[PDB]
Design a protein around this ligand. Sequence first.
Ligand SMILES: NC(=O)c1ccc[n+]([C@@H]2O[C@H](COP(=O)([O-])OP(=O)(O)OC[C@H]3O[C@@H](n4cnc5c(N)ncnc54)[C@H](OP(=O)(O)O)[C@@H]3O)[C@@H](O)[C@H]2O)c1
Ligand SMILES: NC(=O)c1ccc[n+]([C@@H]2O[C@H](COP(=O)([O-])OP(=O)(O)OC[C@H]3O[C@@H](n4cnc5c(N)ncnc54)[C@H](OP(=O)(O)O)[C@@H]3O)[C@@H](O)[C@H]2O)c1
Ligand SMILES: [NH3+]C1CCCCC1
Ligand SMILES: [NH3+]C1CCCCC1
Lengths: 344, 344
Amino acid sequence: SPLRVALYGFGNQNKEMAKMLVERKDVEIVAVISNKSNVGKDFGEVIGLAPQGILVTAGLDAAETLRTTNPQIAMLSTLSTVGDIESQLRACAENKVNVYTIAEELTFSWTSAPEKTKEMDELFKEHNVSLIGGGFLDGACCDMARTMAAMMHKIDKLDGGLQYNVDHYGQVLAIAHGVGLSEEEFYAENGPGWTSPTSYPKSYVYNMNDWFASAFGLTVIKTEEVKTPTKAPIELYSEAIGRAIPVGQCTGMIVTATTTTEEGVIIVEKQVGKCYEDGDEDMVFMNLEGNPTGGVGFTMKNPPTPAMTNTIAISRMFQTVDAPAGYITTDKLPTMEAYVHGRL
Amino acid sequence: SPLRVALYGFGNQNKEMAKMLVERKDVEIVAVISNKSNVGKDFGEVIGLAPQGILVTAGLDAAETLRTTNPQIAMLSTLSTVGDIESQLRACAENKVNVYTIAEELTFSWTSAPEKTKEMDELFKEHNVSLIGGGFLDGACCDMARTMAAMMHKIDKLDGGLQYNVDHYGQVLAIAHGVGLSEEEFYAENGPGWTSPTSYPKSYVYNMNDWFASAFGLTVIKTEEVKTPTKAPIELYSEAIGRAIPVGQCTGMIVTATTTTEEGVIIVEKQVGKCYEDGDEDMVFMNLEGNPTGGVGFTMKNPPTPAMTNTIAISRMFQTVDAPAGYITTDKLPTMEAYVHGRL
Ligand SMILES: NC(=O)c1ccc[n+]([C@@H]2O[C@H](COP(=O)([O-])OP(=O)(O)OC[C@H]3O[C@@H](n4cnc5c(N)ncnc54)[C@H](OP(=O)(O)O)[C@@H]3O)[C@@H](O)[C@H]2O)c1
Ligand SMILES: NC(=O)c1ccc[n+]([C@@H]2O[C@H](COP(=O)([O-])OP(=O)(O)OC[C@H]3O[C@@H](n4cnc5c(N)ncnc54)[C@H](OP(=O)(O)O)[C@@H]3O)[C@@H](O)[C@H]2O)c1
Ligand SMILES: [NH3+]C1CCCCC1
Ligand SMILES: [NH3+]C1CCCCC1
């Protein structure tokens, strides 16, 4: 009975997702794949649990590990773009393995990466399995918004976004938000504030704007990004880069994405990713302007964003397995699978 | 093609629901039923639209009006208890008419009214049609909570509620919240703060606690209500009762409902219904304690509660028609039908 589940990647996210998936009598872990870190060790011992008789497999051996242990789904928590994860998707699809990924761009990648996306769509189609993703962006932002949007007669505008602590996802994410950079270093070709329609990767709110445009059945004209550095009126320390941020030096990044459609509906979403002052908490906000009038809005104050990314992924496992073949964006799925007691 | 829709009741709620349902090319209004008010007049003229060639039918003629005009669903916006609406449900069920009602108790009535509810369940079962309801409590409170709850690994406690303006739903609702009453008049057998487990009707949060217990697959031990009057440190005028409320006189009602379950999960929900001070806005709040830890919460500030009650009902029409026979609580339904452009 239990669903055959592979962890593809085994860092901060897939380490916590494991803890929860062990407690779930609904699921069995048949493989754990890292690239290098922890290879050879029993996944449980890594986590602080008793050994489970499943060892961390090597990156280069993924394809054979999936061939053998025959999972129905892979929880792919490695990199953030269809390009970066192409190698791991091919391992999955070729071995008839469905995947749900927390790759942020796979929230909705058809426009940010149409070449690779078309490719992965046709691949998963070929091998009769499903590609789905987005994590926190899928569930806490888009799917919550989708439930609340059901209560609209007409939507003229969606206005929302999220704030997250850029220091708590490691160095790579911090660098990608210009955490250590001068105002001048931040703008510049090799730079995250670089203003150009050719900029890639695209921001999380770009993909999320495309998600709502698909969800609401609208026709995108254009999406534009405005990128500005964040800064602190005091010295802030960054674990991620591992030093003090002087006053006036970039502490992270704001990105607003503005989408126009043929039907006249505007979509604006703001992402704030930065090192935190004392008063700073994670936030999600979504407000709908139209009928009903005055603004139909929800806000989530201080959500445990890291753990919610994993719970969203779990809530998607059976749906991904059951979903049609190819790249399926979650606006084509039911709501995240409902909470019920008795799964443990 | 268009769904055959009867408005059963035609006061403040079903008047606004009509405006929206006319604009929807997806639906056709085949009957409008009041009791007495506006009988004989074209529903459009009542609303401020051009005549639609559908006249307000009389209460006593409901059964024949439904026999004739052959609707698939009735939008029942009359009274608040299975008991009060029994007459209108029988008209519907006997004429093979599905109903979605904004009767607050029908959010989840199995415990507040097990006798009448069993009866209506078996009736709708007999005539191969569906009974569903809750309006704002169903959609803005319970269904939003249900989406957000999907992101929980373990829930130990649900803590939430809503605040609404008790003056803006007319006299009957104001009286039922003790708007004109002395502290002493408020408590007392013939009184809304009357403490007794035999108190009926039950509060909206009682039914909503039962809704979550069903949703989360829990076993209710007991629900208890604590009822306390609200008051203002200044004079407030009430349109609903039509006079000044002296300082210290009840301006409305708080009710907290506390549900214990066999699985150890606690459910607390607070309803505040009162005349508003300057700073007072409608509110919905829902917070989940467990894993993820720290509280997984949403808040909706100043929601247009009256219009959302109607949009929820609209979002439920096709689902009610498609639903199995009998009394179906919305925790057995998909999420409110998603917003899509091109319905008008
Ligand atoms: N959607 C969301 O809300 C959300 C939230 C958080 C993070 N993310 C994204 O999710 C990803 C993972 O986050 P994280 O914090 O867990 O990252 P992490 O701590 O760096 O862990 C990533 C893991 O993937 C492994 N890996 C990388 N390339 C691999 C390959 N080709 N084959 C096999 N394993 C490979 C790494 O191996 P080694 O340990 O050997 O290097 C590591 O175990 C990142 O893209 C991050 O941006 C999305
Ligand atoms: N779930 C929610 O969020 C929510 C929100 C708002 C209100 N409610 C409830 O919804 C109901 C309606 O609200 P409202 O403000 O629209 O009330 P309203 O303004 O008083 O209108 C009620 C309508 O029902 C008609 N009616 C009553 N009994 C009838 C019968 N036996 N046959 C036919 N028609 C009958 C009335 O006829 P006449 O005009 O001739 O009297 C009137 O047209 C109430 O129970 C209210 O408590 C629920
Ligand atoms: N990588 C980010 C994804 C969205 C939440 C914050 C982390
Ligand atoms: N009758 C009340 C139903 C819930 C919202 C406020 C009005």
